[PDB]
Design a protein around this nucleic acid. Structure first.
Length: 49
RNA sequence: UUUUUUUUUUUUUUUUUUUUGCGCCGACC
């Protein structure tokens, strides 16, 4: 941003990095209203349902 | 030549508007 030299020598290298399956696309869940359990009349369990 | 039964009136149409449970395994914080 500033374009100035950093006051410290920054350690930089090549590191093998792995992307894991824990993605936010499969983890975001939002429920307002919907299906309920027949026995307890309470909200169901799971993002799929 | 012979006894021991009783008797009367007041309630209406062809018909109508969302898979629960059981157990197992892996994994995140």
């Amino acid at each position: 941003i500033t374009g100035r030299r950093l006051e410290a020598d920054i350690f930089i290298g090549v590191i093998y990095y792995q992307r894991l399956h824990h993605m936010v696309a499969d983890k975001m869940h939002a429920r307002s209203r919907g299906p309920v359990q027949v026995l307890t009349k309470q909200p169901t369990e799971g993002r799929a349902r």
